[PDB]
Design a protein around this ligand. Sequence first.
Ligand code: HEC
Ligand code: HEC
Ligand code: HEC
Ligand code: HEC
Length: 107
Amino acid sequence: APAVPDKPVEVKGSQKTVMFPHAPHEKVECVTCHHLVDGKESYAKCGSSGCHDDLTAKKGEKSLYYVVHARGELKHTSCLACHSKVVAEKPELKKDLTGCAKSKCHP
Ligand code: HEC
Ligand code: HEC
Ligand code: HEC
Ligand code: HEC
């Protein structure tokens, strides 16, 4: 596996960029996010060509927005799906981890 980033990295949407910090996620398996594709490890950017490269649609497996924000029955864990579970146990973090504004993702 490539080196984990040791600084926040950009996650570019069509119109917003959110910084993603690996450090809070150190106990999360890499593969939870960097899921296998065709049975093989991959660490390419989520919005890479051939992956979640629809940066404007809100739904569909190609939609970057959907795979970040869906709280529905997806095939891998999205940011908001896991954060919803975290804030159930740590409700002081509700705005920080799930808010659409003034959150840690969208300050
Ligand atoms: C979800 C909570 C993650 C966990 C756990 C790990 N990574 Fe990650 N990584 C994640 C995102 C959302 C991004 C940004 C991707 C983008 O589309 O811009 C990254 C970035 C990386 C990179 C750079 C390449 C890339 O995919 O952009 C590397 C090399 C990387 N991450 C490695 C890595 C490893 C080795 C992890 C476990 C120790 C790991 N990440 C965990 C999301 C998440
Ligand atoms: C191309 C090599 C990809 C990269 C890099 C990433 N994803 Fe992906 N993702 C890809 C496929 C072919 C699929 C569908 C098959 C499956 O394995 O379920 C997915 C699926 C997801 C999902 C589920 C979406 C659904 O509709 O159920 C999520 C939540 C997801 N991917 C997230 C995700 C993230 C956060 C990534 C960067 C860290 C990422 N994927 C990389 C192809 C590829
Ligand atoms: C569980 C499997 C997670 C997934 C998937 C993602 N995140 Fe997460 N995130 C998780 C935890 C346990 C925490 C720490 C909560 C605590 O107890 O402190 C976080 C934290 C963040 C933060 C806040 C960092 C800070 O400012 O302190 C951010 C900005 C964040 N997470 C972003 C993020 C994104 C964009 C994700 C999908 C690519 C994502 N997280 C997935 C657990 C999990
Ligand atoms: C971190 C866990 C997030 C929280 C909380 C919320 N959003 Fe988010 N959002 C996040 C990322 C990683 C990105 C960039 C990648 C992508 O394209 O999804 C975004 C981006 C947006 C955008 C812009 C989309 C674009 O194409 O530029 C919008 C409109 C947006 N996010 C809305 C939104 C809402 C409604 C939220 C509350 C439920 C919310 N976000 C929370 C990460 C995170």
